[PDB]
Amino acid sequence: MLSGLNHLTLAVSQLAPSVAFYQQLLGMTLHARWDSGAYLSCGDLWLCLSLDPQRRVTPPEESDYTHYAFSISEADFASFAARLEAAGVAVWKLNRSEGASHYFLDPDGHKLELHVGSLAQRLAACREQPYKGMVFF
Amino acid sequence: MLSGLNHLTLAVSQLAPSVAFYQQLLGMTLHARWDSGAYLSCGDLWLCLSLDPQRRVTPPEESDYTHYAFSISEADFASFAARLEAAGVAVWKLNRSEGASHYFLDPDGHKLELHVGSLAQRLAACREQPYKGMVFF
């Protein structure tokens, strides 16, 4: 059967600024880069940045809610979020509707998130403060 | 410090067919559902389906190369691809790179992939046959 996420591939309009964002600003590990892409890791995540002439820099009001959240510890969350803010990283959401999260945009407008907590912890929190109509299986 | 992918959220235009696709067709575990979304898991992956009226059913020619690959064993790959084909799931690309890959679309046109092989395997192949302009770190 399916066992998890093998890799996440993001189309990027300019490879070097995107590599710099994920490696320098977000601290991911750069393993290789070539004329049309790069491979990074973030813990167990394999991230591929793929240079795509079709990628548009997209304002958050023009894209749907599809987004990618990265795990961070409770101890590191606030200072990492504040550093992104001080660096001028654009945002896309303020209301914490799914726990402790910081919502920010990559250079092409990919919707990213810092989140503290696992699925199990989110289900437990939702039992006390459930989303409308929530059912648990 | 970021420690991995916390969750992947896909915006969906209709919750029921998306739940059917990820849970029943793709075999993911459904943990909870509410009026505007669902939580599933696939191995370590926490997947959220978020009902979003701004989600367009998007032909693959009209979206960029951003895509989400799920892990599957080599032994299971062909029968899972055949299952998707029997279900009439559209393919958006043929495989031309190392490791088995099946490129398929979700009901809203999210670009998905079944892939066999790790980042370490890809890097080993690339070291032997580097892409144009490839540098390793």
Ligand SMILES: CCN(CC)c1cccc(NC(C)=O)c1
């Ligand atoms: C994406 C462009 N920006 C400005 C937000 C950028 C890129 C790489 C690194 C840093 N800043 C630090 C401190 O790493 C900032």
Ligand SMILES: [Mn+2]
């Ligand atoms: Mn999220």
Ligand SMILES: [Mn+2]
């Ligand atoms: Mn891929």
